[PDB]
């Protein structure tokens, strides 16, 4: 039932809203409802990420609705993760900063479901160089705090984060990340990030429990 | 004796750091091209 | 030793970067393309060659740059290079290679 | 503080119980309480798996109590999985079948936490060859149901499952595994596996929720 809905959203995604022979809001709500009930397979996730990440004619409300109901069934692939990472920052190919904050929030909430959590370590510099962008900084810091390992705490990133902390007048999300840095190198001069939506976490857990059934 | 090893190994660290930030800074979709993706991704 | 693999990886990567600069970046810098690619690669080569030449002396790693060089602007906006605070005609790389436990 | 508890339990596990100078059970109860509260990191899991699978002088009640409290924090490594796999079946060094049944129950309950779930596919024969052992058959069937892929459904395995199903009379755990074999192939003669302990599952989930915080 779900791949038929994505096939429709994909087609409507290709043509402007007023040229659509049907309003899409009814079909976006069917997809939203199916995702809330069943989750999104690995393959459906990948198609949804393309729809959320490439420039198309979908409206912001519909994209945010999809993002907020993107509960994975089973795992989360590198293909999906990297697409959201490549969406981040400024550029004519990239989505709005508001959706970017939602994608970053999402990655924190599904971090435990990545097939290859190390892939975020391989793009650590892409995430880190974006800390200047205030509109996504809180979500960036939380994700970076989960991704940071000792190999990433390099002197130039220590200095960059200290300068950014001083120039913003002390962002508490920046000092939370610096705390993680200090755990690897206590030599450094001195919010413990909580889950951003407990009810979403609880709903994901319910969906995920079906993986034990057979 | 071994200062040569990490000198070559560091020389890769500088190229990978600069190559990744250059491709990610260009604005190009580096995710959906294998060549560009290898340029950006650090090693596991 | 494992040393020429860190040399094989770096010669391979250096060719991939030069391909990217020629095929994609030089065109973007125009908005001729060939001229932009040659000067961005010269500048990155000069930048990297020096960073190591200092080793410890962080102060010596600045290259002289033409007044309005778009290459430097792009490298500074991409966070791969930094101007000198006192004057913006010299320019250093960010020192990705330096590591505390290297 | 969990390292020191395991150290002491390892030491006492090599001493026959009548020759000990102090009971080990109060320390096992401290271990069990710590596991319930914080779970077991990957490195602690390996040490506990060694305690549970190598022949020692710990009593069956103490081994079961640790198994029932073996909540992983984060992931389950291949080496941990393979320690348990290598303990299954009959052999001078292997644990009791009753403990083996709890090991297989555990693998089912932590299946979603394996770093590399494919590891169980590489030892498929080991699992499938144990099906005639009634004392672990219900737990084997559930794990087999989760792990079997098309490559594993060879003609000789289909026949052995039908031979075993005939020889036991009705066995709904075999019927359930044959149902799984019948998605991959259409052609042969025609109990959904629920999670064995929802309370354990719920408690594991709450411990796992800490991975989203930094």
TrEMBL record, chains A, D:
It comes from Chaetomium thermophilum (strain DSM 1495 / CBS 144.50 / IMI 039719). It is found in: Chromosome, Centromere; Nucleus. The chain holds residues 8 to 229 of 683 of the full protein. It comes from the Eukaryota. Belongs to the CENP-I/CTF3 family. The lineage of its organism: Eukaryota, Fungi, Dikarya, Ascomycota, Pezizomycotina. This is Uncharacterized protein.
UniProtKB/TrEMBL annotation, chain B:
This is Centromere protein H C-terminal domain-containing protein. It is found in: Chromosome, Centromere, Kinetochore; Nucleus. It comes from Thermothielavioides terrestris (strain ATCC 38088 / NRRL 8126) (Thielavia terrestris). Belongs to the CENP-H/MCM16 family.
Automatic annotation (TrEMBL), chain C:
It comes from the Eukaryota. It is found in: Chromosome, Centromere; Nucleus. Belongs to the CENP-K/MCM22 family. This is Uncharacterized protein. The chain holds residues 161 to 328 of 328 of the full protein.
